[PDB]
Design a binder for these strands. Structure first.
Ligand SMILES: [Mg+2]
Ligand SMILES: [Mg+2]
Ligand SMILES: [Mg+2]
Ligand SMILES: [Mg+2]
Ligand SMILES: [Mg+2]
Ligand SMILES: [Mg+2]
Ligand SMILES: [Mg+2]
Ligand SMILES: [Mg+2]
Ligand SMILES: [Mg+2]
Ligand SMILES: [Mg+2]
Ligand SMILES: [Mg+2]
Ligand SMILES: [Mg+2]
Ligand SMILES: [Mg+2]
Ligand SMILES: [Mg+2]
Ligand SMILES: [Mg+2]
Ligand SMILES: [Mg+2]
Ligand SMILES: [Mg+2]
Ligand SMILES: [Mg+2]
Ligand SMILES: [Mg+2]
Ligand SMILES: [Mg+2]
Ligand SMILES: [Mg+2]
Ligand SMILES: [Mg+2]
Ligand SMILES: [Mg+2]
Ligand SMILES: [Mg+2]
Ligand SMILES: [Mg+2]
Ligand SMILES: [Mg+2]
Ligand SMILES: [Mg+2]
Ligand SMILES: [Mg+2]
Ligand SMILES: [Mg+2]
Ligand SMILES: [Mg+2]
Ligand SMILES: [Mg+2]
Ligand SMILES: [Mg+2]
Ligand SMILES: [Mg+2]
Ligand SMILES: [Mg+2]
Ligand SMILES: [Mg+2]
Ligand SMILES: [Mg+2]
Ligand SMILES: [Mg+2]
Ligand SMILES: [Mg+2]
Ligand SMILES: [Mg+2]
Ligand SMILES: [Mg+2]
Ligand SMILES: [Mg+2]
Ligand SMILES: [Mg+2]
Ligand SMILES: [Mg+2]
Ligand SMILES: [Mg+2]
Ligand SMILES: [Mg+2]
Ligand SMILES: [Mg+2]
Ligand SMILES: [Mg+2]
Ligand SMILES: [Mg+2]
Ligand SMILES: [Mg+2]
Ligand SMILES: [Mg+2]
Ligand SMILES: [Mg+2]
Ligand SMILES: [Zn+2]
Lengths: 251, 50, 71, 68, 91, 108
RNA sequence: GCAAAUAUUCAAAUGAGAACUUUGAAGGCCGAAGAGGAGAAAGGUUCCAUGUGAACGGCACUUGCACAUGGGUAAGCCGAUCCUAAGGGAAGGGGUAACCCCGGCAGAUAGCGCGAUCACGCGCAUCCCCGAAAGGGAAUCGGGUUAAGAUUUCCCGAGCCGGGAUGUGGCGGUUGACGGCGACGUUAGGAAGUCCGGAGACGCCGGCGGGGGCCUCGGGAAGAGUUAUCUUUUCUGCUUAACGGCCUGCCAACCCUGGAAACGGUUCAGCCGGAGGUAGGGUCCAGUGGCCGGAAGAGCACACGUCGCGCGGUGUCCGGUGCGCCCCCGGCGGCCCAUGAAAAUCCGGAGGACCGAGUACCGUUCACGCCCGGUCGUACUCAUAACCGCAUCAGGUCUCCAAGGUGAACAGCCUCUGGCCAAUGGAACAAUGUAGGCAAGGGAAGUCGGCAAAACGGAUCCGUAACUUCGGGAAAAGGAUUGGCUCUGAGGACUGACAGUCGACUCAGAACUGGUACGGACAAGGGGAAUCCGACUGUUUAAUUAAAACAAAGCAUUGCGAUGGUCCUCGCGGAUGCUGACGCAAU
RNA sequence: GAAAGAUGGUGAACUAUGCCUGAGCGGGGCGAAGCCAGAGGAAACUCUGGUGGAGGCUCGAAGCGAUACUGACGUGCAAA
């Protein structure tokens, strides 16, 4: 055979990320003394649309804690933020939509976004458009907390992980039908070369395990094992089940 | 082209001075074999390729 | 003198020969500048100026003769 | 490219160094007094014939007066 | 003149894309164009500027919002929850 | 009608290759090459224009090319911020500086 | 066999020899998205002159892009150079048996920098170089000129930028200017480390306004053409650059007085207003706008008269227009699950460390003055003959300029500027061909198959079915009119419900008329009833398959919460990732 | 005299796809939201005329492509 598209995507040749107009990494602030042990006042200046990402970005202009200059930080906008708002960072930031607090300071039941995972890695969960994590519970004997991620999973995170209270903006975006291959194309230009996506069944055997045959069919079980060598692991990987999801399994 | 590098102009100079039929007098030097200039080049036939 | 036109010397559609949008644009600037001339000459006070202005926008009047008769 | 308006200033800008010359072009209705310094050509449009004559006299001795 | 019996904003798509796809994009073609009330100056001058970004023309304030409506019901629940949760622990 | 030709070896009609047709003392039409339209300065606070300064391509604002008067506005923060913006900054500075000592009053 | 791209002919001249050269008269073609004028690439001397035995120019030659001998490419202002983008190479380090491979891995990082030396202090961020003759960009215009160079390289004139010092004058010292209520104004008007902001710097589409150029109309002046006859006629031209000063001040934006409902203002459309409209009055901005300097001495056009780049003279005026075409600009409106590049360079601002006189000294981003401006490219073609296709090959190859008529029109058809008649010629009209027509009666009976061709075709008025996702079908179908001439009517602007002047165009109707011809050339849908397939638009085997195939939106399934999923690497490591479940991945 | 096998290198000047930066696409036809007026209504909102100018809409110029004659040529103008 020959190397298969699922294998060709790891090269970087044409499949790299189309990031010429992206506005930079959207993440929190470098955690420091002031924001360990108090609050810092920063002011939003603009809500800028970040290309290739559904969530708006908020330019936040802090004042540098110990040198004399501004700090243009760049957050993932929580639905509610507006220009001119004061967002406060730290542990004694009041629980206001837009402020970022450690989880030691979010009462249980509260919605948060952009959750860090190792204290100071600047936000990894609940970041895409319109997704949030609920702080289910706390454990102060180990200094940890638990959250319900967007996926429906439940992760124990350090109680000093920061989080932006609220939910990410841009929610409800994936409800609108695109209705056009044109819309799909203009969606994927600014993310990466991953569209149009050709059915394997309409390929020749030399480039896809489903390929060939006087009719179009897979010809063998489309569920492949977890360990199958790269180039064989195409189809439905390590599937626990298939068919339309009914009943409890659809939870 | 009209915008040519000085290297290419430098080498066009020499590929110009290398086009003349052999002098009239060489042909009588003693025990001579050079008959015509077998290294002619024409602008329309044999492109320099550089 | 109006010669050489007609239904055989005509080979464009009405819109292409003279857009309905340009007819509208001219006739609106006409009626409207008449209305401003009246409102400045005090033949109209501002209230029936505004009422006739919205009616001109709304196409009751097809020419300044009837805009003047109805004023 | 620079025109001066008052005869006293034209005289002053011609009774200086760098005054290379003074062209004088008489045309219909007027005379034009153009003094050539380094950067700018200074020009004066004059109307009274006797006053133009007085200026013609008043040019500093030495400054080559071309007559066309 | 009434110009479309039922289509409305989705009449531009013409005879394509299917009855239900048109009928289920109509409700969000309307919302992403509608003028929403601006709470900072009281005008109806907020119109979508980009996906998730709703800006007002007079007061220059631009406000991160839903994808096609300025205020999503989910963020309304969120705002009420956050205020309740703040106030029960401030005391 | 006496067609035209470019005067430089730039044969493509990019933004930088703007052309203006002029008729010369010879009765002959030539091109002149023009600058591109520049925006001129804008207030960060409002985004509006900034009054009192022309709209020049940035290099030709250089100190040795314009008169100083033509490049600045004699106000505090003038030539970067607009009149309303400076007015609102003065008001906000005053009100917040006075509020600070009104908040030091309440500490008793 | 030399056959597409309409076309050639007559005198003359040179020459041993003329269809092929040159001149002149004629006749036609390209018909301005050109067979015209310039370039990018690529070529390399093909460019120009003088000559020429051969060869070559698929016939011919006096001829040439052939052969020989000479000539030709001038820059402070056009470029390259400078900056960065996608991206590339790399020092330290890590890998590799070694060639080679990795650049964010963070290492006393490659560069240190800034005031200062009569030395030292301060800062060191995200830290090298390369990368565009279409992106960003210090600065130039007009008229001449050579056999061949230049539009702006040379020449005459007029400027501009950068850098280097310096001299005179002026400006400020309430130390660091004045005016205005305000927007802001005046060509002068301290500022170190530090910080901030703007320009640079941005998608497509609709439509409106303006500016420049062209076109069109009329008058005036010059010359040319027509004239058996009619023509105040027809044709050509009547120009004004950068640069400096003044004036104006569009459409937006902004300031001051003032206080709006009986709501008003305004757009083709929007929209705007107690967060202050209408109004009165101001500021600023564009300008490819007006006047003046540049500048009539230049250029053109006529008119003469001088032998030999002579010289002399006259003119180089005045209005009006527009759904008009090109370029640009302004400001609105729209579209986006797409928001539409970076940096050099420049300007502005915050703060105010530190500084000085008034028999005189510290500045001055002001005026004028002096000097210097380096290296490389520069001729020519840019194509049915200078590039690639073994060619002087109907192929292919990125652009700018773009007149008149008809017409909706950059369709076609004819013309002017400009360019050509280069495609081997002579005789004849046989078959068979290739391209194009026409046919009585019949109209698919031919044929596998209505293949090919014919019929319809513009526009105005009327009418428009089944079916339908209620958006379409739809130009459905079926009808009628169309010329030319003479008129009638309607539709406006400016100036002082009327009067004066002007007005390029569109739309209705009537008469008269003709061998019933009128979208008179050109251009220009045949229609309907149903089935099968694919939803549609899109893409596909370059050189036999354009499709029912692929993509697609929609639906669904699977893996994965970073110590992870899919994938690449010989290794160190990397792609998705500037990512995070509304995400990546696999079907 | 092969079809092949291998070692090391050379090619994206054609073409394939991604990206950066520029250029380009007359004239017409249908008539979507929005806004205006008139008329109607207890209301909800409806009827009539405008305006507006949407769309991977449509006839079509330059462009790009290649369906049909299975036309010309087929030792061609041309290895399309
Ligand atoms: Mg793809
Ligand atoms: Mg799919
Ligand atoms: Mg598929
Ligand atoms: Mg297949
Ligand atoms: Mg296989
Ligand atoms: Mg198969
Ligand atoms: Mg089977
Ligand atoms: Mg060749
Ligand atoms: Mg009629
Ligand atoms: Mg209309
Ligand atoms: Mg342009
Ligand atoms: Mg000023
Ligand atoms: Mg024969
Ligand atoms: Mg032949
Ligand atoms: Mg064109
Ligand atoms: Mg040409
Ligand atoms: Mg021959
Ligand atoms: Mg020649
Ligand atoms: Mg470089
Ligand atoms: Mg460049
Ligand atoms: Mg450039
Ligand atoms: Mg900027
Ligand atoms: Mg740009
Ligand atoms: Mg006003
Ligand atoms: Mg001007
Ligand atoms: Mg816009
Ligand atoms: Mg040259
Ligand atoms: Mg040249
Ligand atoms: Mg070859
Ligand atoms: Mg016409
Ligand atoms: Mg035409
Ligand atoms: Mg017959
Ligand atoms: Mg039959
Ligand atoms: Mg039969
Ligand atoms: Mg039969
Ligand atoms: Mg049969
Ligand atoms: Mg047929
Ligand atoms: Mg039908
Ligand atoms: Mg299809
Ligand atoms: Mg289409
Ligand atoms: Mg094929
Ligand atoms: Mg085919
Ligand atoms: Mg990874
Ligand atoms: Mg073997
Ligand atoms: Mg390529
Ligand atoms: Mg290529
Ligand atoms: Mg164009
Ligand atoms: Mg079409
Ligand atoms: Mg076309
Ligand atoms: Mg054939
Ligand atoms: Mg044959
Ligand atoms: Zn608002």
């Amino acid at each position: 055979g020959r190397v298969i598209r699922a294998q060709r995507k790891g090269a970087g040749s044409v499949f790299k990320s189309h990031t010429h107009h992206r506005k930079g990494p959207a993440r929190f602030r470098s955690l420091d003394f002031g924001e360990r042990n108090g609050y810092l006042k920063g002011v939003v200046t603009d809500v800028i649309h970040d290309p290739g990402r559904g969530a708006p970005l908020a330019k936040v202009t802090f004042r540098h804690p110990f040198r004399y200059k501004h700090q243009k930080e760049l957050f993932v906008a929580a639905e509610g933020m507006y220009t001119g708002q004061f967002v406060y960072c730290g542990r004694r930031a009041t629980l206001s939509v837009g402020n970022v607090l450690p989880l030691r300071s979010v009462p249980e039941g509260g919605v948060i976004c952009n959750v860090e995972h190792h204290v100071g890695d600047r936000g990894v969960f609940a970041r895409a458009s319109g997704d949030y994590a609920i702080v289910i519970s706390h454990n102060p004997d180990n200094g940890t907390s638990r959250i319900k991620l967007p996926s429906g999973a439940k992760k124990i995170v350090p109680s000093s992980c920061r989080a932006m209270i609220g939910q990410v903006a841009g929610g409800g975006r994936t409800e609108k039908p695109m209705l056009k291959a044109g819309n799909a194309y203009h969606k994927y230009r600014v993310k990466r070369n991953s569209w149009p996506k050709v059915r394997g069944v309409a390929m020749n055997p030399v480039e896809h395990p489903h390929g060939g045959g006087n009719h179009q069919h897979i010809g063998h079980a489309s569920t492949v094992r977890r360990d199958a060598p790269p180039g064989q692991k195409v189809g439905l990987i390590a599937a626990r089940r298939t068919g339309r999801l009914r009943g409890q399994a659809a939870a | 082209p009209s915008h040519k590098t000085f290297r290419i102009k430098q080498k066009l100079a020499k590929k110009q001075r290398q086009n003349r039929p052999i002098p009239y007098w060489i042909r009588m030097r003693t025990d001579n074999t050079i008959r015509y200039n077998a290294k002619r080049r024409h602008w329309r036939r044999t492109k320099l390729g550089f | 003198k109006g010669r050489h036109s007609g239904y055989g010397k005509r080979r464009g559609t009405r819109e292409a020969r003279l857009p309905t949008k340009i007819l509208w644009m001219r006739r609106m600037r006409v009626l409207r500048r008449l209305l401003r001339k009246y409102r400045e000459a005090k033949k109209i006070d501002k209230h029936m100026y505004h009422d006739m202005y919205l009616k001109v926008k709304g196409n009751m009047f097809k020419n300044k003769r009837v805009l003047m008769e109805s004023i | 490219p620079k025109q001066i308006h008052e005869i006293k200033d034209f005289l002053l800008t011609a009774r200086r160094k760098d005054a290379r010359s003074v062209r004088i072009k008489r045309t219909k209705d007027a005379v034009k007094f153009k003094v050539r310094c380094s950067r700018y050509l200074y020009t004066l449009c004059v109307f009274d014939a006797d006053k133009a004559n007085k200026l013609k006299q008043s040019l500093p001795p030495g400054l080559s007066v071309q007559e066309v | 003149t009434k110009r479309t019996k039922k289509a409305g904003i989705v009449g531009k798509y013409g005879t394509r894309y299917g009855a239900s796809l048109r009928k289920q994009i109509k409700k969000m073609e309307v919302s992403q164009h509608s003028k929403y009330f601006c709470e900072f100056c009281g005008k109806f001058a907020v119109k979508r500027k980009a996906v998730g970004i709703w800006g007002c023309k007079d007061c220059g304030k631009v406000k991160a919002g839903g994808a096609y409506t300025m205020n999503t019901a989910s963020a309304v629940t969120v705002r009420s929850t956050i205020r309740r949760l703040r106030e029960q622990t401030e005391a | 009608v006496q067609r035209l030709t470019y005067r430089k070896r730039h044969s493509y009609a990019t933004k930088s290759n703007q052309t203006r047709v002029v008729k010369t003392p010879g009765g002959k039409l030539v091109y002149q090459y023009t600058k591109k339209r520049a925006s001129g300065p804008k207030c960060p606070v409002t985004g509006k224009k900034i009054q009192g300064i022309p709209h020049l391509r940035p290099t030709e604002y250089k100190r040795s090319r314009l008169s100083r008067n033509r490049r600045t506005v004699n106000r505090p923060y003038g030539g970067v911020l607009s009149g309303p913006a400076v007015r609102e900054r003065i008001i906000r500075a005053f009100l917040v500086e006075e509020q600070k000592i009104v908040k030091k009053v309440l500490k008793i």
